[PDB]
C-alpha cells in the first residue's frame, strides 16, 4: 500500500525573535518509507539538519522528525519541503509561529 505524508512544522519551545530554538518537521502517516524532507530558510535548504530513527506506528505507517537549530526573526521565512511517491509536486509547509 501507499499513503501520503502528514506534515507539521513547529518550534520546540515558544518562538521568541532573536532567540535560538529548534525547528521541527514532523512527517508521519506515510508508507513507502522513502521520503525526502528538507527544511527551507527563505526558500533555501539548510544542510546540517538531522532526523530521528525510522519507526512506525500501529498501522505500519512510518514517521520521522527533522530538526535544526534556528533563531527566529521577523524577516526570515521557514518551512518544510517534503517529497514522496504519493505527491505529484512536493508539499511545502511554512512555519507559522502560532501552531
Amino acid at each position: 500500500i501507499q499513503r501520503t505524508p502528514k506534515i507539521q512544522v513547529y518550534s520546540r519551545h515558544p518562538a521568541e525573535n532573536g532567540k535560538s530554538n529548534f525547528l521541527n518537521c514532523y512527517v508521519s502517516g506515510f508508507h513507502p518509507s522513502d521520503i525526502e524532507v528538507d527544511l527551507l530558510k527563505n526558500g533555501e535548504r539548510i544542510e546540517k539538519v538531522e532526523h530521528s530513527d525510522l519507526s512506525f506506528s500501529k498501522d505500519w505507517s512510518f514517521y520521522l522528525l527533522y530538526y535544526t537549530e534556528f533563531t527566529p526573526t521577523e524577516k526570515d521565512e521557514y518551512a518544510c519541503r517534503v517529497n514522496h511517491v504519493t505527491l505529484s509536486q512536493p508539499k511545502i509547509v511554512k512555519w507559522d509561529r502560532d501552531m
Binding site: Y10, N24, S52, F56
Partner: protein, 270 residues
C-alpha cells in the same frame, strides 16, 4: 497504566545493487533506547538512552548479533514473499515487524505480541494467547503452516512472557530517573483574533511525558466539538511531547469555553 518494551524493525529491499536496508529501533514506553541501522558505519547496536550505556560489551555483542542475523533472515524472506505474491524483482518492497511486552506496575506480565507486515499490510501475527497464528492471507497461510510445524510459537511465548519481562523490569530500575517520572504538561491558552466577531482560542499542552494526553474544549459545561481543531501529538524533540486544540469563538464570548486537559502526570483538574 503499565510499561512496554517494543522493537520496531523495517527491511526495505534495494533492487539497484546491494542488500536491503535494515533499521531496528527499541523502545521502553515513549523512549527510544537503542538503534541499529545497517548503512551506519559502525555495524553496531548503538545506545540511544543514557541509562542503557551502563550495559557492558556482552550486551552489545549479543544484541548486535541478533539484529544482524535478523536482517539476514528478512533478506532471505524478502525474496520468499516476492515468490508468494509473484512480484517482479525490479520492485522495492518493505517488511516490518513489531514485537514486545507490557508488564503491569507490579513487574508482572500483561500482554506480549509479535506481528509483521509485507508492504504496509498485515502478514502474520501471533494471537493474544501466544500459542496460535493469524495468517491474513494465503501467502501468510503458507508461513503459518511452516511455523506451525516448527513449533516456533513456543519460542515466542518464552521470550515475550519471560525474557522480555525480565529485561524490561530491569531497564525501569536502571532507568527509574526518567522512565518512571511522568512529566505533567505545561498548559497555556492563546487568543488569536480574526475579524471583529470571531477569534480562535488555542489551548496548548507542552513538555509532557508520556505522550498520552486528552485535550478537550467545553462551552458552558458541555463538550464542544463542532468548530474545534486538534493536532497530532508531535515530538518536541527533547523526549517530551506537544499537542494543542483550538475552537473558533464569537468575540466577547471567550469566557464560556474552558479547555480540559487530562494526563497521567496530574490528577485531572481544570
Amino acid at each position: 497504566g503499565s510499561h512496554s518494551m517494543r522493537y520496531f524493525y523495517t527491511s526495505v529491499s534495494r533492487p539497484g545493487r546491494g542488500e536491503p536496508r535494515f533499521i531496528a529501533v527499541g523502545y521502553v514506553d515513549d523512549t527510544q533506547f537503542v538503534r541499529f541501522d545497517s548503512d551506519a558505519a559502525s555495524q553496531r547496536m548503538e545506545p540511544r538512552a543514557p541509562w542503557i550505556e551502563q550495559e557492558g560489551p556482552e550486551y552489545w555483542d549479543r544484541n548486535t548479533r541478533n539484529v544482524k542475523a535478523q536482517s539476514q533472515t528478512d533478506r532471505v524472506d524478502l525474496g520468499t514473499l516476492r515468490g508468494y505474491y509473484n512480484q517482479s524483482e525490479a520492485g522495492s518492497h518493505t517488511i516490518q515487524m513489531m514485537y514486545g511486552c507490557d508488564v503491569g506496575s507490579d513487574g508482572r506480565f500483561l500482554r506480549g505480541y509479535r506481528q509483521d507486515a509485507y508492504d504496509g499490510k498485515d502478514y502474520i501475527a501471533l494471537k493474544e494467547d501466544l500459542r496460535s497464528w493469524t495468517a491474513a492471507d494465503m501467502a501468510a497461510q503458507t508461513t503459518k503452516h511452516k511455523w506451525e510445524a516448527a513449533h516456533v510459537a513456543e519460542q515466542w511465548r518464552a521470550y515475550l512472557e519471560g525474557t522480555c519481562v525480565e529485561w524490561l523490569r530491569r531497564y525501569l530500575e536502571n532507568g527509574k530517573e526518567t522512565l518512571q517520572r511522568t512529566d505533567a504538561p505545561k498548559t497555556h491558552m492563546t487568543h488569536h483574533a480574526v475579524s471583529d466577531h470571531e477569534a480562535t482560542l488555542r489551548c496548548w499542552a507542552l513538555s509532557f511525558y508520556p505522550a498520552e494526553i486528552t485535550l478537550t474544549w467545553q462551552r458552558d459545561g458541555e463538550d464542544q466539538t463542532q468548530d474545534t481543531e486538534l493536532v497530532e501529538t508531535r515530538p518536541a524533540g527533547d523526549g517530551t511531547f506537544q499537542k494543542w486544540v483550538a475552537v473558533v469563538v464569537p468575540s466577547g464570548q471567550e469566557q464560556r469555553y474552558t479547555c480540559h486537559v487530562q494526563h497521567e502526570g496530574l490528577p485531572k483538574p481544570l
